[PDB]
Structure formats: structure tokens, C-alpha cells
Amino acid sequence: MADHSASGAPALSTNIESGKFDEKAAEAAAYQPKPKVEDDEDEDIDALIEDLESHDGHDAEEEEEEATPGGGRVVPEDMLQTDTRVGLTSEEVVQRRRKYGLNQMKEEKENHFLKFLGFFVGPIQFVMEGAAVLAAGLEDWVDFGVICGLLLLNAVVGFVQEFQAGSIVDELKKTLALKAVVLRDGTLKEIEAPEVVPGDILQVEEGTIIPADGRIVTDDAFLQVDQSALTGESLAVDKHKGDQVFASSAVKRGEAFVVITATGDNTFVGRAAALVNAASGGSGHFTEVLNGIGTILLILVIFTLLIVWVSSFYRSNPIVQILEFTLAITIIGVPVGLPAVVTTTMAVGAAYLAKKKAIVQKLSAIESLAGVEILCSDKTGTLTKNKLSLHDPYTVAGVDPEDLMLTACLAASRKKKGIDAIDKAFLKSLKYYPRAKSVLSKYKVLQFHPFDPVSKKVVAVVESPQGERITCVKGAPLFVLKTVEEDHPIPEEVDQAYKNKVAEFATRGFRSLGVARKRGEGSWEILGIMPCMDPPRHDTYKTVCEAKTLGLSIKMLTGDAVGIARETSRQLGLGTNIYNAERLGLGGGGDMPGSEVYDFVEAADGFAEVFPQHKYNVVEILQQRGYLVAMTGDGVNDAPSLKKADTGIAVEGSSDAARSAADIVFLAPGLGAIIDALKTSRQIFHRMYAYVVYRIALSIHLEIFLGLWIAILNRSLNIELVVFIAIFADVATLAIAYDNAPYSQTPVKWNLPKLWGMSVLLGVVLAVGTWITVTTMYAQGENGGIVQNFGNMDEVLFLQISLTENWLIFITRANGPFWSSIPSWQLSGAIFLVDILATCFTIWGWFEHSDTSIVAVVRIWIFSFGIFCIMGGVYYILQDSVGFDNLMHGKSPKGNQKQRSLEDFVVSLQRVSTQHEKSQ
Amino acid sequence: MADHSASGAPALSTNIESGKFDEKAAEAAAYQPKPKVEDDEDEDIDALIEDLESHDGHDAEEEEEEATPGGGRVVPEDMLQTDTRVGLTSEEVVQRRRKYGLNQMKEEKENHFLKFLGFFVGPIQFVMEGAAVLAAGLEDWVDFGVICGLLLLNAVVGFVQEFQAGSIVDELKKTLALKAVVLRDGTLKEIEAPEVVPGDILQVEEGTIIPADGRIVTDDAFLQVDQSALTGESLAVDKHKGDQVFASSAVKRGEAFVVITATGDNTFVGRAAALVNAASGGSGHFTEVLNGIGTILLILVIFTLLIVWVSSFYRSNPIVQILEFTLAITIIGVPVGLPAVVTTTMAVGAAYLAKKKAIVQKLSAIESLAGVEILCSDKTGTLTKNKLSLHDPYTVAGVDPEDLMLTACLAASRKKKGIDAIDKAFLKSLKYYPRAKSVLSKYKVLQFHPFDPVSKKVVAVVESPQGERITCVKGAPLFVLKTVEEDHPIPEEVDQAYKNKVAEFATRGFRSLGVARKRGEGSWEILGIMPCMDPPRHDTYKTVCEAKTLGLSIKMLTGDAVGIARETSRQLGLGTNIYNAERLGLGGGGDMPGSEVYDFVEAADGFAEVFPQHKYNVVEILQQRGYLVAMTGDGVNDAPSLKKADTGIAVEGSSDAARSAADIVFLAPGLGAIIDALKTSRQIFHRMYAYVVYRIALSIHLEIFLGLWIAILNRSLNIELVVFIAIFADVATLAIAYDNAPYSQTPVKWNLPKLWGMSVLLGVVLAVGTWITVTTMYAQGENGGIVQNFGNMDEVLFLQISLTENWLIFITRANGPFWSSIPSWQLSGAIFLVDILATCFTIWGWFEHSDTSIVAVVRIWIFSFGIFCIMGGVYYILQDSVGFDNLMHGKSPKGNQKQRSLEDFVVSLQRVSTQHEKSQ
């Protein structure tokens, strides 16, 4: 009774809040710049922060500056001093967000990108113009202009690439994560601190952290808070009237109602935070691989080009031409737009994540997530629709003799704890019985005998006010009932019957609990049992299937018995229908008379009934085999394992702490959701690969094509048509992105260790490239011309290049899928349009010199295809092993079986540890 | 007595019904189209189904629409409402069949075939004409016409290939499988639901499923049915008078007589079925291999051809000629007719299956069946002509003291159960004795002590009305009689004698049973024993031999003792005459004091006396060694193993459930039948291979032959003669099919894993091809001509091609057999006719330019042979191992022997578990 009523009152807020990606659009289109009437040197800004936090109080001629007193002095007595009252004006929120945002300061830095590549290229184009204007009397008519023209195009791209990511961040404001309950609807609601604009009513309780500077309104008796983080002395502060909740810690003392006054840089624990962040160095893995490649491209290009220059005096051209050939080759080569391209994908990709009841923060975590190999997920609420709620309690006939009801009511324990509707069933159940009351919600409990391995069961010695004595027991069915006595003697029937039912229940699920009652635990008095099961669902059942197809290993952690656990595992699809005892479905039991379960635990999934300080070792041990992991928080006992791991997945309706030591959040408290996530991540990588291959492969051909002519051929490379290819080939194309549907059909990629653009990929580019590169020389380099002066060679040398690259860019679609054309709609649209430029470029202007347009053009198409087919093969891959490797496998047979049998043997002893012991 | 009389009455229908493949011919020649006065959009049709099933009742102006009330509401009370009466008019059956057919909706889909190949080719021919008519002023006289002409021919083939399969399905109506008993003959008869046309009297009993909407006539007291499948609530329905049997489940409550009213799409559980089937994706293995190859041909051809085009500017021909060379090469290459060819074989092949008292459904199961490696078949009724009927019961002298007759009568158990004539023998036997009565059929049995391993025997405590007490025992001879006491003391003689006889019986078969009688089982009183044996037969004894020659492993599951089992095994041929104890013949005994038999079971065949929940593991374990399987249903306990397996073979006179979790049925309840099946399956594959080799091999030569000329030679390729070869070579030929007699001499093929057109086969085509390809260049490319203008080169270049390909197509006969000409009669007929075209094509028209006709023609014959010989060698294959591989084998000797001995040792203990125990 009086327990819950108090639980119900203080909670409930069904819809996080269906509040669109709008407010962001409006806000972001005025962010970074504009108002803020103070534009001092950045230097003074930092100093101001370190001078504000604490320090005495000078006049600023502005409303504000009360947050400083928070981390400079107690602020106990004076807090009521400062005084309270304040709300926003919708306006303040838009600005505060832009400067404070996510009440923790994050550093955004460039590992160089912007400078070493950024405007290092920009200068080249500038000196190009310089050279252009330097040549007074030069016989080159408008070359200076052309280069200037091209350089402009390159830039256009420059700015474009850099612009979208900025606006993207503005649109991230106003989301819904955790830490901050406010009053909006008809009930208190939860919302993000950043969104938690000043004004909305927040509610701080025990153990919670202040999402923002809040002016206390009232509540519980005493309100204690730890201001250490800000000031000093770990001594809790007694906030008196119209108090103030900066961001300190609520030392589980009292509860408070409040209004958010400060919510940004102007924040209390947002002032001692958001305005003081000296620097440091630290990079991500893949970023390392990327940087590494950038270099291997940096030198590779800048060298091959140099060659195309000095090895051309043989071609009979002044080193000058060769010079502007190497430099020219440099420009094309320079795979630019990488920072912008992966930042856009990161930002956008993270939006969709956020868009699907799965809130993910820090784009630096996507990398890892994409490489997830194992997913350890809790059952109730995540995997199963049924919280850990046993609806099938069951007790035999009756007796009604006093303590009879006591035992039945108390020892209806369970697994988890926290309440549900499961207990209510018990409440009403009692009612069914006599008519009395409470029994359910109640009792005076002081001592708890920790569940010891031998007897296999927990118990608690409780004493009613005026009563005899009672001790309620819970634990495994078998062992518990082995004791049992109960009012009337333990008849055979009663026994047999009890078992059978539990068995019946647990062979298709059901999570059996054994309840008796004695005083110490020795005594025997079986009351009943309360099993459970749970309809999996929509995307979990399929998501699991996807997991296997993706290689990803999913482990379930539940508070159900191994028997049932295996049943659930089998039900979902984890473990098919095959009853194990080896690991799959069955697994192990972090049990005492099952200890040896640490071998069963690591049964590659199923884990049922485990303890603390072992999480630690389990992660260590699992990692020792290079098993990555996506875990789900819980208690302090799992903290070490959490930190050890790499990915932390916290439930939206869970704890924030966990969401910190992690890299994402579950709103859609569904399991199927994660498999989807893994899917996207995998999509992100392939696409990146396909994107790189196209760029590099296609670009490499131009590298030596330039070289070729450098030595032979005849025609030339010149601003005009060259600049064209450059614009249509090195721009958007290398850009493009799309999700690959099959991609969930590829094992997880190794990060840290695994080398960037894979060797095979390197092969893919060289292959496709080497074709078109050569296919250029013989495109017409055989063909047939009548006068020798390039009036056919050029018209195609350019038309072909433009067309091929087109081709390559379509061998860049999904890196996982093999053999797909006309995809990427936007990409295709570009192809046609791009092709159009080419046609016009050849039609009128050159309408009188076309010869290659009749049977040279067709040849393009006939070969504009081989590129697609080449990829189709690459994409489909099959490994070959020399018939001796598989043979060894022929041997693995037995010892494998033997091992299994052995495991089973002992695993057999563990089914009845006590009997065995007794027998011995 | 009163037991059987009631069994006899309710059964018997000797001939499934000798009803020909006629009615099908007539029906199918009007199916899909015609009447049905409503041709709405397919959209409305689906919606109509989901709107019918349940939903309120609008007017349609037609007789019908009563089936909807079945799955929309109880329909208990109202069922008598709707009312009953209705029969067909022969007409209705023909139509209902066409729309309903096999009261389960099957999806027929094309994985592309029809479109990506179908009319993708059709367009090419159309644009060919377009190009033809586009060239106004072209100097090519009638080329447009020629191509149009050819394209027509290609089509003719197009339609032809697609037409036969459609009509084939019409001819499948009217067959005899299971589920549906009707009154036609002088007794109730069984027939297929689809054939079960409205009108015929059906009889539904307990546990049966309603084959069709039936208007109940009457029968048993209460008739309960579960309408869940349709409506809701698992609560059985009490069908009152003139009831209705839609398709619900008969909850083993009552028996009913009825008349089938609705039998099609208009069906009750045919309405909630046959009109609602949203889609999905799922393909077969080999289909995967096929599709895979299609691609490898798709690209291969479309590429080599492209080459034959652009590498021909060297030949001195405008890219145009080379263009229509690549495209031309494309057409020939494109191994078309694959969908039609394998669909025809599938359909037809499945007809013959159905034609031979072996009913097989779903052409997607043939693939697997063909690859059957192991066949686990039950003895009685399948392998042996003798049902499990022991005719040699035998008891000693007499006593006549009361309970003496009791024991003898009751404990005459057996193995199986269900009745036979075996029991009748016992009935009459008793008669022989005094003259009394029943004893046989009777007794009051309530309790059954499950046969426990120690004592090795089952027993049942029965109590007559007014009598002392009695407990009948059955089980292994040895152990049972070890107890025995009986009226008069257990004399030595009596004992010794008893044994000897059983031994005598069981060393040439005989399935001994031990019968006593006590109360608990301790007591001893031997009554007698009832062995058995069984004449194998015609095709079983030979079929078994075929199995071995085919590699297929056959396992027998019987209810006879190991001793006898091995005898039967030896008798049949499974296990020769060599008494084992290792596995072959003897095998194992799913016995208690034989437990270790799980190693003997997997003795590679023989299994005698096994239990439930082990089927599960046995299949799992067997599969763990890549052992495929064709199994035979039975009980619920074998269900898991059945689902695990891949092929289910159910007896025609058996259960339907099994026939579901399977892929075929045994009408001819013979074992020999399966071996025949395996034979056909194997025939189907080879033929396919031979068919592919011919097509591909022969086609590849034309691929580069085109290329050759592209570079050199002189003559040309042109519509006329080219179109001819195309018509006679790419049509029927690639088509043809035949059964290979030896083919039962080849081990089973690996499906899923094994690669399609085998590498060796790839070699076979390339070999044969490479010959004729080259043999063309030197056919006359050496020969001797006087003027240089092709008047000899052409006349033969075409005549040869036509002749060779002829040759190749005969290297396509049975892929298993090696060295066979003039086979395939139809094929040969074609050869001659085809050859004729060639002769005329050369004779008159070209009568004045022939030079090659004298000694060029003979040369054809001399080499028109080497192709046959080449195959003959390929077909005969011998493996070579380096003399060290066999040596290891020299070592296997011992350890093999040692292992056997060891097995035997323990296997020796198992012959007398109890003695041993006692001694210990």
C-alpha cells in the first residue's frame, strides 16, 4: 500500500515528448554570430572564466553574474541571498544552447585537415594567378584567366564542403536524452538539460545531479547538496528557502522542486565548466588509418607527378610543361573533401540514430559501434516485452492457519526487485483469499542472510510487530522444495505435482522461484512459486537473425533460471530449438553449486543468475579473446567491467551514469534496435570504401595519363576541358553516400588493428583504374585518324575520361553488394547531367571536327560496362583452402564431442550438487 | 472380440482408386481462363478475401458466400443455420481445382528468369528491326528482313519453352494422396481433397482435419471441433445437426459422416487460406548455383564478344561489323531455355514419381531427394512383406490350472502394437486349448509399469472383474525367463528347451518376445514367446544392392531384437551374411543394459529397440557428420528429429502429419521403391550436366570463331546460314533429356556446398569445344582453294559447324555413362533431320561452287567421331594417389581392429548386463 501510492504519485511521463527537429532549423540559422555585445580578445575571455569562478564582484552593467558565488563560497546562507526568480524568453534558450549546449564542454579540433590541406591548396591557386599575371608578354592567351577560373571552381567546392557541417550542429539543439524532469504536460516530464530551458519546473531528488542552475521552490524537510565539484569542503550544504541548484550533487538528502534560472555558459556548474578548457591531444583509430592513407596519397601523388614532369624532356617539351603537369597531377590526385565528407556522414548518420528512439552522442563512437562484434543485452524490457514480471504464481489449495498466509505473501520474491504489476497480482491474490489487507506491501525486515551456495537460496529474517517468528526463502525450485514441510505434512502428491508444473512451465519459458518459510532456512514450508516468460517481438526476433548474418554475437543477461533462460534463448532465436547445456540457449548459471559455470557462462551467450565483482573478470577474460562489446549497465558491481569494455548502452528509462561510461542510449528499449544500429554502422563503412575506390581508382588513371602524353601521344591537357573533368569528377562524386541493404551479410570489421583502405580494395582501384587508364591509350590510340592533328583524339580523350570516371563512380555504390547500376538516385541524376555537359562540349563548338562521335562513342558504351562487371566479381568473393586445412577439421571431430560430453558430465553434476554431496 | 469388429467395420479400401491421368487432360485444356463472370483488378480481389473472412454480409447476386461465417463467428448454433445440402456437377470440380487445387496456397514465383532474360532478349530483336528500318538508303538488301526472320525463330522457341509447363499443371489435378475418405465403391474410400469433389461422402473422426467444407450428415453423440485456425477461442464447438466441417480441427471428439459442399477457393478454411498470400523471398540451393552460373555466362559472353568487336579494327572492318559481332556472339552465348528446360524436367520427373505408387509433392524437393545419402527405413511393411506379425508363437505342453491361460493370453504382447492377424492366431490358439472365449481380446488394464532398464521388460498390472491378481510381462527372452517360475516348477528341461528354440528361431530371423506373469514383475512364470521373420522381396533386395552402388546408406528401424535384426539385415543384403556385433547387420539396441548402444546404433544402419527424445539427438549427431537423410515418421517423440532432418517419407497408409514435415510419400509401401527414386533423381542431374556441357561447349566455339574472322580468315557471318545453325543448335538440343541406367553407379552429389557445373565439367566443355573451335580453323583453313573468294570455305564453315555441334550434343547423353552414340532416339532423329537441312543447304543453291563436298565432307566424319571418344574417356575417370596415402591405410590396420575388439568386449558385457552386475 502506502509504498506504491508514493511511487505512482512521484512518476510517469509516457512520451519523452514528440518535439520535432524544427526549433533547431530556426535556431541554427543565426548561431555562432550576431548579437552578444562584447567582442574582446579570446585571451580575456578565458581569463574572465578563471576570474569569475569564485572571485570578488566587479560591476559589468548587466543582469547575470550569480553563479560565481556558488564555487567561490558556500553559498548556503546566501543563495536565498542572491534570491531566486527567473525564467527564459524562448530567446535566451536559443542563445544559451549555442554557447552552453550540452552542459559539458566538448572539444572540437582539427588534426590538421583545415590547414595542411585546407588553405594550403588555396595558396597554390593564388600563386597560379601570380604566375599568370607575372608573364607580361607571354604568348599564352588567357591561361591566367582559365587557371583562375578553375581555382574558383575548386574553392566553390572548398567552401561548400566546409559549410554544411556547421549548420548541422545547430539542428542538434533541442533533443531529448536524460537528466532533467520538468513540468509541461499534465505531469512531470523528462527532457535534456540543453532543452531544459530556464522556466520549466525541475525536480531534484536523492542521488541526482543538478542538470542546471535551479532556484529551489520547496519540498522535503532538509535539502542537502555537495558543492565540492564547484567549491570546496565535501560537507553537504543545507539549502534554505528559495535555494539554488547549480549542478552540485544531491547527497541523497531530501527532494526538491525548482525552476531553472541559469541554463548555459552563464550556468553555475556551467560557468566553472563551459568556460575553462586548456586543450590536449587524442585521436580515434580509423582516423589514424585515414591520416595514414592521406600521407600515402600525399607522397605517392606528389611523386608520380614529378616523374611525369622530368621524364618528359624525352617527349620534347620544356621542363616547364612537365612542371605544370606534375603540379597539375597533384591537384587531381589530392583526394580532397575527406574531412568534409566523413564529417557530414558522421553528423547525418548520428541524426538518424537520434531520429530512431535510440539517442547516440559523440560521433567518435560510431566508428566503434560499427565494429561491434558482441552484444550483451538484458532480457526483461530490452529483449522481451515482458518486464521481469511473473504472472503465473501458483499455490496449492489452502489451510488458512495464520502464518500460512504470511509465508505465501512474503516469499513471493522473484529475481529483479523494483516493483511492477507482477506484485499487484499477489496483492489481489491475497484478497481473493480471506479479505484482510496489506500482507503484500509490508513487513518489518532488518536482517538478510545473503544467498549462500550450499542451500542455494536467499532468505530474510523478518519480525511482525506482535508475532511469533518468520523467515521467508527464495531460490531455485528443486533445492528449496527439497526442504519444505509446511502446515500439513509434505505429501507425496503435493510434491510430485509441484515439480511437474514447474517443469511444464520452464520447458517453454517460465522463470520458477521457490518460496518456503522457516526462521533460519533449515525448516521447510513451501508456499508456492512465481514463474514467467515473454513475447519477443517485431525487430528483436529478426534483429537477432541479422546479428548472426552480420557475425555479431548477442549475449543475454537475465534473472531467470538456466532452464527457462535456454527456453527464452530458443524462443527468440539466439539458441534455436536445440536444447543444449553446452552454452547456446542453456548457457550457464552464475551459481554456487554451479560455480564451474564460468566455463558455461562463456558459453557464447546465455548467462542466468550471476553476481558482482565477476563482471570485472568476465570482461577481462572476454577481451582476452578480442571480443568487443556493447553492454548494458546496472549496478556498482558491474562498473569495473563497464569501464573495461568499450561500448555502453543505457536504457532511456534508466540511469544517466551508465549513459556516461557508454557511447549511446536505448530509448526504444528494444533489442532489435541495436541490430539496426549495427546495420547502419556497417553501411557507413562500405559506402566510405566505395567512395574512396572511385576517387582514387579514377584519379590514378589521370595521374599517369598525364605522364603518357608527357612521353608520347600528341594532344595536350589544358585548363578548359581539363577543369571540366576536374569539376564533375573530383567534386560531389567522391562525396556521395548510401546505405547498403545486404551489408548486414558481412562480418564485423577489425578497427584499431585492421589497415585502412584494405589491400583488396587497393587492388579493386588499381584493377578498375588500370583498365580505363589503358583503355584510354587504345580508346583511339589505335582507332584511325587521317591528318595527325588532334581533332578526334581530343574530342574523345576528354569525352571518354568524363564518361569512364562516371563508370568508376558507379563501381563505388555499396562496397558490400556486388553488381548494381542506376542506384544512388542523386548520383545517377548527376551522371546524366554530367554526361550532358560532355555532349554539348563535343556537339557545338566542335561540331565540325567530330569523327569519333559515330563509332568511337558506341565503343564507349560497350566498354562503359566492363567496369560494372569487374566490380560485380570483386563484390561476390570466395576463399580457397588447400584440401588439407578442412581435413584437420575432420579431426576436430571428437575431443570436440569429447569436450562437450565432459562439460555435460560435470555440467550434469551441477544439476543436483547437494544430492551428490550427500551421496558422497 | 467387440474391439476388432468395430475396427473392421470402420475401415478397408484396397485400391486407392485406379483413376487415370485423363480427367486432367480434359480439365487442363480450359484452365486459368474462360468463364468466371468477374474480371476486377487484382487489387480488389485480395481486399475481397480479407473482407470476406469474417465480415458482415453484402449481396453479390450469386449462390455461395457461406464459409465466411465460419471464421467470423462461432458458427456453432448457425451452421444448421446456413443449412447443409450441396453437391458438385463434375463441372464445379474442374473449376474449383483450377482455383483451389491442393487446399493450401503455394506460391509460384520467378526469381527473374521471365523478365531479366525473358523479354529482355525480345527487345533486342525489336530494336534490331528498328535499326533495319532506320537505315533508309542502306546498301544492305533485306538484312532487316533476315534479322526479323531469325528473331521470330528465337521467339517461336521463346513461347514453346514457356507453354508446356502451364498445361502440365492442369494434368496434376485429380491425383490420390491423403486426407479425405469418401463413399464411392462398396466401401468408404480415401482420396485427395482436390479430387474430393463436392458430393462424395467423407468421414471425419477424432484428431482428423477437415479436408474441405463438409455439411455434416450425422454420427457419434457429440461432435467437437476447434475453429481457432479460422476464428477465435480454442473452445471446441458443438456442431449440432446438419453441421459443417470447414477445415477446423476435430478435437478427438466424436465421429461424423458428411458430404462435401465447398471444395475450392470458395472453401471455408480454403477461403481464409486460398485468398490471402502477401509474398516473401526464399530460394533453393541448386537454383543458387544455377543463377550463379547464369551470371558467369552473362558477363563471360557479353565480354568475350565485346573483344571480338573492338579487336577487329585490325581485321580492317568498321567497328559496326564488330559491333553486330559482339551482340551476335551475345545471342548465341546466352544459354537460354534453362528455366523452361529444368521446369519441364521437374514437372515431368515429378509425374513419373507420382505415376509409381510413390506420391511426391513440390518440385523443390526433388533436388534434395536426388542427393539422398542415407535412407532410414522401418522394417515391417516397408522393407519386409510381413507386417510386424509373429506367426510362430509357442508354448509348452499344458496345465490348464486357471491363471495358466491368463498369463499365456495376456503376455503375448509383441513389439509394435496396433492389431493384425498375428493376434488372431492367438485368439484361435486359445480356442484350440479349452473352448471358452475372449481371453485374447479383453482385460481391464489401468496401470503400466514403464519398461525399466535393469529387469529389461515391460509389464502391466491388470485386474479382472472378480479375480485374484495378475501382472503380464514382456521383453527380451534371456532376462525374462531368468526369473520365470510358473505353475509347475521351472524344470531344467523346460528351460534349456525354451532357449534353444528361441535361438534356432532368431539365427535366421525370428523376433523373440518373453512372456511370464507375476503382479509386480519380481515373480516368475514363463508362458511362451512369439517370434517373427519376413520375406524381403522383388525390388527391396535389388534396390538395396543399388543403394550401395549409389553410395546411399540405408538404415533399418525395427521393433525386433538385435539378434533377429542382424538376421533380417543379413537376409535382405544390408548386412551380408557376416554376423557382426560391430554395426553392420547386428548394430545396436536402444536398450538399457545396452545404453552404450548409442555407439552401436550409429553402427551405420541397424537399430533395434530404441526410445523417444533420442531421435532428436540421433539426427543432430548424424547431421554433425554431414549425413543427409530420408526418414520415416512415427510418433510425437520423433517429431524433433523429423524437423531437424531434411526429407520425410510417409507411408500412404500412414499419417498425413508426417507427409507434411517430409517431401514425399510411399504408396508402394516398399523399400525398393526409394532406391528407384534415388535412381531417377541421379538421372535428372547428370542429364542436366550433359545438356549444359553440349550447349556451353559448342556455343563457346562460335563465341571466338566469330572473333577469329574478326581478325582474319575472309568469309563472314550472316543472317541466313547463321540463323540456321542458331535454330538447329540453340533450340531443342540444349533441351533434350534421358535417364541414365548406370548412373546408380555414382556416389551422391553434394548440393548446398558443391559448385554447379563442376570444374571437371567446365574442363569437359572447354576440351570438346577447344577441339572443334580449332578444328574449324584447320578444317579447311589449310585445306586448299584456287581463287581466294570463299566458295569452299563458307560451304563448309557452316556445314561443319552444323555437323560438329551435332557431335557435341551427343557427348551430352548420360553424364554418368561413357561412350554411347545413336541414343536419345528423338535426339538422333533430330540429328538426321538437321543434317538434311545442311545437305540441301549445300546441294542446290550452292550446287555450282562445291569443292569441299568430296574430300572435305569425309574429313568431317573422320573427326566427327573424336568428340565421342573424348567424352568416353571423361566419363570413365580414375583417381591417382601418391603411394604414401594408401600406406597410412596400412597403419589404420589395428586400432581399427583394436577398436572393433574393444567395442565387442563391452558389446560383450551388454549381452548379459544383469549376470555381470550380480557377479560384481
Side-chain angles (χ1 to χ4, degrees), chain A residues 481 483-495 524 526:
Chain A
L481 277 94
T483 310
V484 62
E485 172 190 2
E486 89 178 7
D487 187 354
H488 188 80
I490 310 93
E492 296 180 2
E493 303 178 357
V494 163
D495 187 2
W524 38 135
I526 59 154

Side-chain angles (χ1 to χ4, degrees), chain B residues 398-659:
Chain B
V399 179
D400 191 348
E402 298 182 3
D403 299 3
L404 180 60
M405 168 265 313
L406 173 67
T407 19
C409 174
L410 299 192
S413 300
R414 42 217 175 172
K415 333 168 185 183
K416 276 190 63 187
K417 297 182 182 180
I419 26 169
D420 180 0
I422 180 180
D423 300 0
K424 180 179 180 181
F426 291 96
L427 181 59
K428 181 179 179 180
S429 279
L430 279 342
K431 298 180 181 180
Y432 286 104
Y433 293 97
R435 331 123 177 187
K437 61 323 160 161
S438 24
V439 83
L440 201 38
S441 314
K442 132 201 214 190
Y443 53 88
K444 158 187 189 183
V445 184
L446 182 59
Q447 299 181 1
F448 300 89
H449 292 102
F451 53 95
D452 98 292
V454 179
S455 287
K456 166 175 188 187
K457 35 183 240 86
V458 321
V459 181
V461 175
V462 303
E463 174 184 4
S464 77
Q466 272 195 15
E468 289 191 23
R469 303 180 179 180
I470 191 61
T471 298
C472 299
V473 178
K474 2 168 172 178
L478 301 183
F479 301 90
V480 170
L481 277 94
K482 178 182 179 179
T483 310
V484 62
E485 172 190 2
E486 89 178 8
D487 187 354
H488 188 80
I490 310 93
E492 296 180 2
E493 303 178 357
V494 163
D495 187 2
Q496 301 179 358
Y498 163 86
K499 194 306 170 296
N500 299 301
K501 191 154 183 87
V502 83
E504 290 183 4
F505 290 118
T507 41
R508 0 164 127 172
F510 138 64
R511 187 294 183 270
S512 70
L513 173 313
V515 301
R517 142 33 167 27
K518 135 113 180 196
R519 301 174 176 176
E521 298 180 359
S523 177
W524 38 135
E525 306 181 359
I526 59 154
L527 324 181
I529 64 165
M530 55 254 81
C532 178
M533 86 278 83
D534 56 26
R537 185 176 178 181
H538 182 269
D539 300 0
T540 199
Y541 183 87
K542 181 179 179 180
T543 237
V544 303
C545 179
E546 283 187 18
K548 300 302 180 181
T549 61
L550 180 60
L552 165 60
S553 180
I554 190 60
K555 279 81 171 182
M556 168 183 278
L557 293 81
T558 189
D560 297 5
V562 300
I564 180 180
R566 137 260 125 122
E567 299 301 359
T568 299
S569 288
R570 112 180 180 181
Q571 184 179 13
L572 277 300
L574 306 189
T576 57
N577 287 131
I578 60 178
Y579 186 91
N580 279 264
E582 289 188 8
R583 54 270 187 167
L584 182 70
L586 217 37
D591 182 40
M592 355 325 105
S595 264
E596 302 299 0
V597 282
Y598 65 64
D599 165 16
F600 311 91
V601 69
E602 195 224 332
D605 291 14
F607 122 68
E609 184 180 358
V610 182
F611 306 87
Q613 292 182 7
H614 244 128
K615 306 301 182 184
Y616 159 93
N617 278 308
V618 300
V619 287
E620 176 182 3
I621 60 183
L622 195 51
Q623 179 180 1
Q624 185 157 172
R625 220 119 181 185
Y627 284 109
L628 301 186
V629 186
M631 188 73 198
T632 310
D634 166 19
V636 298
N637 66 312
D638 298 6
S641 80
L642 292 186
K643 71 168 85 290
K644 184 72 63 285
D646 281 5
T647 291
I649 303 175
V651 179
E652 198 302 322
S654 94
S655 290
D656 195 353
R659 292 190 232 206

Side-chain angles (χ1 to χ4, degrees), chain A residues 578-579 771 778 782-783 819 855 858-859 862-863 865 869 894 897 900, chain B residues 295 298-299 302-303 306 309-310 313 319-320 322-323 616 624-625 644:
Chain A
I578 60 178
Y579 186 91
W771 179 298
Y778 126 88
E782 62 149 309
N783 191 175
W819 179 280
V855 300
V858 182
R859 275 184 149 194
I862 76 123
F863 272 92
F865 167 76
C869 78
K894 347 159 157 177
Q897 298 179 358
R900 297 181 182 180
Chain B
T295 300
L298 180 195
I299 183 158
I302 65 159
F303 186 84
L306 300 180
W309 147 91
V310 70
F313 180 90
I319 180 180
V320 174
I322 61 175
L323 179 64
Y616 159 93
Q624 185 157 172
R625 220 119 181 185
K644 184 72 63 285

